[PDB]
Amino acid sequence: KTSRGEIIISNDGHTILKQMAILHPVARMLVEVSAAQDSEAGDGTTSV
Amino acid sequence: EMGRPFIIVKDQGNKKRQHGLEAKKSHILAARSVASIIKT
Amino acid sequence: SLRLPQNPNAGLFKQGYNSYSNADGQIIKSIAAIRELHQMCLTSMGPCGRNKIIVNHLGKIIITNDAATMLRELDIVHPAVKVLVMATEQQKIDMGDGTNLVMILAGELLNVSEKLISMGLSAVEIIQGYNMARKFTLKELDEMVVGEITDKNDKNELLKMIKPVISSKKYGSEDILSELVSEAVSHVLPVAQQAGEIPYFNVDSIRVVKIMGGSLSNSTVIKGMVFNREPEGHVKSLSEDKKHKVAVFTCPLDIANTETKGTVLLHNAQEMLDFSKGEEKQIDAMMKEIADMGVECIVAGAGVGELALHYLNRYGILVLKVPSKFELRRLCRVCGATPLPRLGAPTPEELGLVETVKTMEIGGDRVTVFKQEQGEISRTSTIILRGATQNNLDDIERAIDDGVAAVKGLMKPSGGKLLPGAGATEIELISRITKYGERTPGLLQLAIKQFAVAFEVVPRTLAETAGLDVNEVLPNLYAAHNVTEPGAVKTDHLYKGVDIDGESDEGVKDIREENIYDMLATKKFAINVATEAATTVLSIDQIIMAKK
Amino acid sequence: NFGSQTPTIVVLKEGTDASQGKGQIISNINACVAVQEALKPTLGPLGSDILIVTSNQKTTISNDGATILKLLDVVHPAAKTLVDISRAQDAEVGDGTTSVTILAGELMKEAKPFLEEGISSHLIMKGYRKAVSLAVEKINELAVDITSEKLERCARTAMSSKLIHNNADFFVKMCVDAVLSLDRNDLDDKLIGIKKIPGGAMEESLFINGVAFKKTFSYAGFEQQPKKFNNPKILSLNVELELKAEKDNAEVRVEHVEDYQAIVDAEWQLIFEKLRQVEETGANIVLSKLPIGDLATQFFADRNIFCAGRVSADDMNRVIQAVGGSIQSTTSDIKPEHLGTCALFEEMQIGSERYNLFQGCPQAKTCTLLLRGGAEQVIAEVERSLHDAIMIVKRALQNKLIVAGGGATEMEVSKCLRDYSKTIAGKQQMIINAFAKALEVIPRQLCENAGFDAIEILNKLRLAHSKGEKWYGVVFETENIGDNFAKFVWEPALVKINALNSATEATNLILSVDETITNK
Amino acid sequence: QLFNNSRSDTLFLGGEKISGDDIRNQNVLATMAVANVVKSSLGPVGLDKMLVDDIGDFTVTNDGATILSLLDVQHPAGKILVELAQQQDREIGDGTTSVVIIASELLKRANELVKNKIHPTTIITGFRVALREAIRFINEVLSTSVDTLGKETLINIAKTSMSSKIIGADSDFFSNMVVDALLAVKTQNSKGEIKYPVKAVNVLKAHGKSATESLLVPGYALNCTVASQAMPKRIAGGNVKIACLDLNLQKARMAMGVQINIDDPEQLEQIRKREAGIVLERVKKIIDAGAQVVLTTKGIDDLCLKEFVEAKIMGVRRCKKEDLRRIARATGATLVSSMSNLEGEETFESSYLGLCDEVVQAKFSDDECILIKGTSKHSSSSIILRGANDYSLDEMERSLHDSLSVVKRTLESGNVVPGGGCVEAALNIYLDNFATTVGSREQLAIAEFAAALLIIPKTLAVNAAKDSSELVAKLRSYHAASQMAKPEKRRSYRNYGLDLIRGKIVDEIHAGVLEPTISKVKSLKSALEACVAILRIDTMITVDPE
Numbered sequence A: 001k002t003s004r005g006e007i008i009i010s011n012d013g014h015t016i017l018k019q020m021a022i023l024h025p026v027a028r029m030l031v032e033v034s035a036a037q038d039s040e041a042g043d044g045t046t047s048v
Numbered sequence B: 001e002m003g004r005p006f007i008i009v010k011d012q013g014n015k016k017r018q019h020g021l022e023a024k025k026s027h028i029l030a031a032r033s034v035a036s037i038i039k040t
Numbered sequence C: 001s002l003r004l005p006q007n008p009n010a011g012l013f014k015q016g017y018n019s020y021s022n023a024d025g026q027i028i029k030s031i032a033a034i035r036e037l038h039q040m041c042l043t044s045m046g047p048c049g050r051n052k053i054i055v056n057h058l059g060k061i062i063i064t065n066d067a068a069t070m071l072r073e074l075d076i077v078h079p080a081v082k083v084l085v086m087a088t089e090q091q092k093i094d095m096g097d098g099t100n101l102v103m104i105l106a107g108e109l110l111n112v113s114e115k116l117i118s119m120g121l122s123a124v125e126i127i128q129g130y131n132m133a134r135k136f137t138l139k140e141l142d143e144m145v146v147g148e149i150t151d152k153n154d155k156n157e158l159l160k161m162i163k164p165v166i167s168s169k170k171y172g173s174e175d176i177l178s179e180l181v182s183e184a185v186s187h188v189l190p191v192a193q194q195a196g197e198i199p200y201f202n203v204d205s206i207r208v209v210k211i212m213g214g215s216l217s218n219s220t221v222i223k224g225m226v227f228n229r230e231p232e233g234h235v236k237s238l239s240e241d242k243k244h245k246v247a248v249f250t251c252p253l254d255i256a257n258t259e260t261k262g263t264v265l266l267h268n269a270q271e272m273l274d275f276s277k278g279e280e281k282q283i284d285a286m287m288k289e290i291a292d293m294g295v296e297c298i299v300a301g302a303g304v305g306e307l308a309l310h311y312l313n314r315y316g317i318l319v320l321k322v323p324s325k326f327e328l329r330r331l332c333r334v335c336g337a338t339p340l341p342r343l344g345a346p347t348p349e350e351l352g353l354v355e356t357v358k359t360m361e362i363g364g365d366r367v368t369v370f371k372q373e374q375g376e377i378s379r380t381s382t383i384i385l386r387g388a389t390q391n392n393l394d395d396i397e398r399a400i401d402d403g404v405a406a407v408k409g410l411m412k413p414s415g416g417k418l419l420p421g422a423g424a425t426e427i428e429l430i431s432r433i434t435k436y437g438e439r440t441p442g443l444l445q446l447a448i449k450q451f452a453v454a455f456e457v458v459p460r461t462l463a464e465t466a467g468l469d470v471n472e473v474l475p476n477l478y479a480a481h482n483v484t485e486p487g488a489v490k491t492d493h494l495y496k497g498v499d500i501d502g503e504s505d506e507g508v509k510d511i512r513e514e515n516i517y518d519m520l521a522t523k524k525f526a527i528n529v530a531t532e533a534a535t536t537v538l539s540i541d542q543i544i545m546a547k548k
Numbered sequence D: 001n002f003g004s005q006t007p008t009i010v011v012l013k014e015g016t017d018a019s020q021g022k023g024q025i026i027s028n029i030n031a032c033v034a035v036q037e038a039l040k041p042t043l044g045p046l047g048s049d050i051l052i053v054t055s056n057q058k059t060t061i062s063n064d065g066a067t068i069l070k071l072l073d074v075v076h077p078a079a080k081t082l083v084d085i086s087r088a089q090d091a092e093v094g095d096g097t098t099s100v101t102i103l104a105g106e107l108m109k110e111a112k113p114f115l116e117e118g119i120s121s122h123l124i125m126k127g128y129r130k131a132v133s134l135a136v137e138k139i140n141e142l143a144v145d146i147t148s149e150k151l152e153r154c155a156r157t158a159m160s161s162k163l164i165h166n167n168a169d170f171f172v173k174m175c176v177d178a179v180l181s182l183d184r185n186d187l188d189d190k191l192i193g194i195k196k197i198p199g200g201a202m203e204e205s206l207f208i209n210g211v212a213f214k215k216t217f218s219y220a221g222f223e224q225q226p227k228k229f230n231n232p233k234i235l236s237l238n239v240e241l242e243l244k245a246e247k248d249n250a251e252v253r254v255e256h257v258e259d260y261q262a263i264v265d266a267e268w269q270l271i272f273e274k275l276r277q278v279e280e281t282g283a284n285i286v287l288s289k290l291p292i293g294d295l296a297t298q299f300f301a302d303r304n305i306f307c308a309g310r311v312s313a314d315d316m317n318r319v320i321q322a323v324g325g326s327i328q329s330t331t332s333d334i335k336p337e338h339l340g341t342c343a344l345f346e347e348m349q350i351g352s353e354r355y356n357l358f359q360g361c362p363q364a365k366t367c368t369l370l371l372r373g374g375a376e377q378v379i380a381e382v383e384r385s386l387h388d389a390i391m392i393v394k395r396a397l398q399n400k401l402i403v404a405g406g407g408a409t410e411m412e413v414s415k416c417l418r419d420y421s422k423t424i425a426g427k428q429q430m431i432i433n434a435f436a437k438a439l440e441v442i443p444r445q446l447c448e449n450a451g452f453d454a455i456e457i458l459n460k461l462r463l464a465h466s467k468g469e470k471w472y473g474v475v476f477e478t479e480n481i482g483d484n485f486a487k488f489v490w491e492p493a494l495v496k497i498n499a500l501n502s503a504t505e506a507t508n509l510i511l512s513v514d515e516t517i518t519n520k
Numbered sequence E: 001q002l003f004n005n006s007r008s009d010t011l012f013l014g015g016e017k018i019s020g021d022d023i024r025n026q027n028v029l030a031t032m033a034v035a036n037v038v039k040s041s042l043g044p045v046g047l048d049k050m051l052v053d054d055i056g057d058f059t060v061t062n063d064g065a066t067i068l069s070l071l072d073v074q075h076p077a078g079k080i081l082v083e084l085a086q087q088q089d090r091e092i093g094d095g096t097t098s099v100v101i102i103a104s105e106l107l108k109r110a111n112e113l114v115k116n117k118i119h120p121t122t123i124i125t126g127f128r129v130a131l132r133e134a135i136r137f138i139n140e141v142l143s144t145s146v147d148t149l150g151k152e153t154l155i156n157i158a159k160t161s162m163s164s165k166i167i168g169a170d171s172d173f174f175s176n177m178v179v180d181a182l183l184a185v186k187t188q189n190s191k192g193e194i195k196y197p198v199k200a201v202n203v204l205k206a207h208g209k210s211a212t213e214s215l216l217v218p219g220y221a222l223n224c225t226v227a228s229q230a231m232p233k234r235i236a237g238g239n240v241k242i243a244c245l246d247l248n249l250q251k252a253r254m255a256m257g258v259q260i261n262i263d264d265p266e267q268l269e270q271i272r273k274r275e276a277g278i279v280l281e282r283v284k285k286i287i288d289a290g291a292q293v294v295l296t297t298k299g300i301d302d303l304c305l306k307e308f309v310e311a312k313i314m315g316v317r318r319c320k321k322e323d324l325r326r327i328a329r330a331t332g333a334t335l336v337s338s339m340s341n342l343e344g345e346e347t348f349e350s351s352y353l354g355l356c357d358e359v360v361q362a363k364f365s366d367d368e369c370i371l372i373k374g375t376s377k378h379s380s381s382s383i384i385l386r387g388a389n390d391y392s393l394d395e396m397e398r399s400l401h402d403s404l405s406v407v408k409r410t411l412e413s414g415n416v417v418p419g420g421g422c423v424e425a426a427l428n429i430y431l432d433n434f435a436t437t438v439g440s441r442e443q444l445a446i447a448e449f450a451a452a453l454l455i456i457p458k459t460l461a462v463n464a465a466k467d468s469s470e471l472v473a474k475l476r477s478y479h480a481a482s483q484m485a486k487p488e489k490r491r492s493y494r495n496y497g498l499d500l501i502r503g504k505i506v507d508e509i510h511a512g513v514l515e516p517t518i519s520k521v522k523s524l525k526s527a528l529e530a531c532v533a534i535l536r537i538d539t540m541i542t543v544d545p546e
């Protein structure tokens, strides 16, 4: 559940990481690795 | 809940719980916080 | 226009005081206020009745199915509902039986009175209607009575008495609960057949001590009594026969103290040397005196000193604490001893007789037992009641009080005078009271008619709580009484009643073979006090309250 | 009429709960299922424990229904039925508390769908109360009349689901000797009183034929006394051995000054006369509930006489039964015959605390072991585990009944109930079969904590009861199912009877309730 | 349930974190909490409810479509059942109360399978093989639509949709009304495919006599008031022409660009006249066409009303867009957005006008309605509902609107099946024998799926305040023999259900209750797709608003 009330289901790990509002800065680097994993190949976000 | 105040133990809202894997990580990291004091 | 004058001349009384007249449908509201808690009682009437969690101010909880017990804890605002509380409280104190009948009948008399007041009947005629119905109701209860006990002590007759009483409160299994009471009633009664003496029975004789653990099947009937005490000096199984003696003292077993400034005074060293051993000697003397009489257990009334205890356990005299008045008086009735506050020699005639005093583990704590034998019987026996939940111990204990209260009903009147139960006694009065309305003329006939309609709640309640449809079970039962007494004698249509479990249609297979009956003395005062509950509520046309 | 408002009269107080419904009772069941969920994973040896900290910051670690439920102030009225049966099961038997609570819960869940259908309440209670009568009789047939082979095996199973189960090879050897000291028909629980010792390791414990009590006070002449007596003699006292008021009062008039010296010397004369009577009988060990002054302990310290005080009455009663003496609250009536004796005496350092050891008596009624451990919960868990195991081997001596553990009792009883229900009507049928599969919750969760799949287990139990007549149950070692008689796992039947009776009484109590009133 | 979990222990999230079987239990209680209000509204024995908006306004509603839409729930797991109730109202239009109860029990009964260490992927697979096996069994047990010499079907279909309503007792009178209404408003499209537009009939909120004396209009009824009071109210005679206009007829300015700037003040009055004259030239040619009745979407100024009052023309302002398409479709006219043609000239042709037999304005309890009857080209229909107040008629409006959707489906698809929980009880006997064939772990999933389907006939008996197990046991006995029927009709013990008014098991074909099979198909898939959405969730991440 997002801040604006928009509810969304997501099993892919990349889209899960965007909606998670993580306060720690180093933990937010996993958001962009899944974007690079999503942009290059488009599969295995979770694995990475 | 069904609208009624569903309370079991006294001071329901004050105390918390913790289970699963997150309960274990609180235990091991708490030992590492004390171990860093003793290791040096 | 923006605001009313807000009831002028209202400063005659305080702002918190309020008046409530008969107009504005307020008598209908008082009937509706009764209807709030009356519907709670319907789900609690009969063997399939459901208990109630009535938590209270303290937190102390009681789970129950009795009308008089549950209403004690609830703080009530409406005064007309408090009439039912004190009416049921009167029922519990005097007879100890039929409190739900008082609540459910007097509430329904106010229910059918809702129709009568709405029709236009004056309140004065309503009281005259039920009073004339009451005189005919109490008259016919003596006429349709069948059966009698005629014997104070019998194994099979007590099953007809106790079993229909405790069947309402914590039914469970029938035999294991009924045998505990019928065995204990025979112990305490002074039988004394062929002597012409007056019988006597006390409600406080039979008392139940609650012990956690175990199961209901492991409950036993103790001849004597029990406390959760610990012997001070030593414990003894007392395997020695040739029965011991008992001496009861209400004062503390100790050196004498006066009352006004008991202080030592020693002028010289000669008194200092003898003051310490003087005591030993004196106490020892009194104690030896007590013992040459062959006593081996003394029940103390207050705190016992250590020096007196040293000489008691020397000769193996058991010590028991009873720090209260009633706990000390109940024990004398078992052995039949006469206490004396003096520290001298007990009289031999006053010494009690107890064979054995055992100490065993029942509930994990130390308890002392005083089981007698078949020879030299005693009274004021107890019942060891074992159970898992403390709340269930409370309601089963009050069921024994209701059963013991039912045994009181045999002593005062001439006999038992049992009636048919299971709604048969209520449904029979409907036809008799309905015929009585046809014989009397006047505008009071509708009051007599609605008085009969109010008695339908007992079969309607037992049919609703039994999981059956009341629209089919009730008129099927009317067919047994719509075939009224033909020319043949010994008609057996009076024993027809409702049934909780079993055959369809429901006319029970008699209440006979079933061995369930009701007491006449319960029905007399119940209909009397229930009519008084409806009389005082209907006779008043204005109510005044304060602060709310 | 006296006011323009005319307030409507409420029946109950403001804040007094109103409760009518087909539900209402469902909340009480869900409240019990909530408490039942906390005690759910604590079943069996492969379970877990529960850590609770109350408002006073008192740490506790326990797996017992009782302790856990208690360390919890339950305010819900229907949920305290589980608290009562746990204390009732803990007070009498002392084992399988949890089991009783999980049974209750499942009976309640089955009761829930049935109540979601009109099936009423007296009908559900009649099924369990009629079925539990056959379960008690069936357990009597499952149990054996064993008399051959002359305790050891019953203690290993009672120690399960907690700390000392893995150390059962050492604790069961000495725990069986604890109850053998107790004779028949007495079974005093206070003689098995064991104390706390913060510090040490549990492996270094040992068996003691007597008592070991803390002095709790440092006297002026304590070190002067010898710590080792070859032939000690114990004498229990109750008189207060110090210079003070004699009998609850203090008032002494003296006129002449010459007698003022004599009355003081008389007090010094009688106090040594009180001590000399203790010295003349040869009592080497002196014990008293009341305090002992510095004057007395130094008089005893010169001529090699040990003394101690500041002990409770429960400790004093354990001293008499260990040495076999008696209590004497007067020094003049002391005789040689009432003095207790033992083999030897030695005061040893135990966790920075001194304890007076007695051991080697020919006939000792007492077993008291020192519980040493790291944390205060370790010594507490070793106490509760032994207190639960000692009750089992205690009542095993009262009667010799043995049934198969590992959830084997529930399956054999459930099969006959399915046969008994296959013979009866409709309403009752569904109810008895619902009671049957609800009774199988004990082997259900016992294998879920082990990590095994429940379907393969539960399908193997039902179809294999023909050759597994009665001793058929689960085995955790080989990861298979076989006969429990060869594995030497035993358990008494009294836990099973009281569990079903308490569980049947618990579920039937609130099943006869459809209301909830809460004043204030 | 017991206590709140730790808030982001070494995780560093701004919101809340929860995991394990606790949230799975909260979803079960969440689906059961919203399903309890739907329980008592199921079946003819169910009772209605009322929702208060904290402003005095209230509305009585039985169906769970708009009840759950009004109940603003914040838990997102409950929103799927809220949207499921709205989804089922769009496609099928009936059974919104059943999918919420079926979807909640499938999650409730599957909650026991979660703690058995059965994965949800295996559970839904066992549910899905049970689904397609159930759809084929539903496709086998369906019956034809003839059943006799006469129709004898559409009157019985209305009783199922009309049950559990305030006017369920009057369903015998309204059964003839709904079948006569939808057979009048049929159309033709896709070269032979017949369609039945729902909501095309006009449901008027009238007050008066009773729901029993509700007169069926043989034609469309327009709900609008007359412009002027001096106009003729009743227009008799055959071949009444209907004109449907939408252009702006009141005086309006020239377009945005045009700014009249004048230098010679002599023509300042003339430009004012032609702006007033150019709007009357349009009204002049309509009078030349001879249109007795004219309808306009926009307003009508007083400059135009004088010509209609003089020439005895019925001008009505404040019409809506969706209504005039049905007027032109029924009366045979065509929608005129503007008056023009391919040529440069501007004129009006008589072919644009419709035809009807009679037009009468009627007033009943402050509700003026223009009754247009006798359309020559194509028939139309409207239903004038009558009751206590507007809020009671909203239940009747939803009752009629759901009835049109059910009668729509039985004509589009002739296959039907009996009510009373017949197919719900028949699938249990079919799936129990199939559950043993598959062998491995899916037996419990298929078995518990079948046990959840029995909740529909059980709820009929619970709400009836009668003994439920006896009716379920008797319904179980007859359906148990249906699979073992031993064919050689004498294939009896099928097509039976509960009769709640008498409490017996009788034949639903003779009782006169049916339901289309397509409603059972879409309800089962939409209920299972909602069950798949809730079971697959493991951990929640609620982010607080910034």
Ligand SMILES: Nc1ncnc2c1ncn2[C@@H]1O[C@H](COP(=O)(O)OP(=O)(O)O)[C@@H](O)[C@H]1O
Pocket: C045, C046, C047, C097, C098, C099, C100, C101, C164, C165, C166, C167, C168, C169, C402, C420, C421, C422, C423, C498, C499, C500, C516, C517, C518
């Ligand atoms: N097993 C039974 N079968 C038929 N009737 C019963 C049965 N048990 C009790 N009853 C009837 O239900 C009534 C309940 O009386 P009640 O007012 O509950 O007694 P109490 O004063 O002990 O509460 C009794 O008068 C009796 O006739």
Ligand SMILES: Nc1ncnc2c1ncn2[C@@H]1O[C@H](COP(=O)(O)OP(=O)(O)O)[C@@H](O)[C@H]1O
Pocket: D042, D043, D044, D045, D063, D064, D065, D095, D096, D097, D098, D099, D156, D157, D158, D159, D160, D161, D404, D405, D406, D407, D408, D442, D474, D476, D489
């Ligand atoms: N060695 C064992 N092998 C198999 N099962 C056991 C063993 N020991 C105990 N159990 C099982 O564990 C269950 C619970 O016993 P226990 O752990 O002693 O008490 P609690 O009920 O408090 O957990 C019993 O039902 C018993 O069948």
Ligand SMILES: Nc1ncnc2c1ncn2[C@@H]1O[C@H](COP(=O)(O)OP(=O)(O)O)[C@@H](O)[C@H]1O
Pocket: E041, E042, E043, E044, E062, E063, E094, E095, E096, E097, E098, E159, E160, E161, E162, E163, E164, E402, E418, E419, E420, E421, E497, E498, E499, E500, E513
């Ligand atoms: N007269 C009846 N007899 C038996 N069952 C009925 C009857 N009417 C309706 N039902 C049952 O009620 C269920 C749902 O009814 P429905 O008309 O959808 O209620 P709602 O209009 O509230 O949605 C159907 O599955 C049907 O089996």
Ligand SMILES: [Mg+2]
Pocket: C097, C098, C164, C165, C166, C168
């Ligand atoms: Mg009674």
Ligand SMILES: [Mg+2]
Pocket: D095, D096, D097, D158, D160, D161, D388
């Ligand atoms: Mg245990």
Ligand SMILES: [Mg+2]
Pocket: E094, E095, E160, E161, E162, E402
């Ligand atoms: Mg419908």
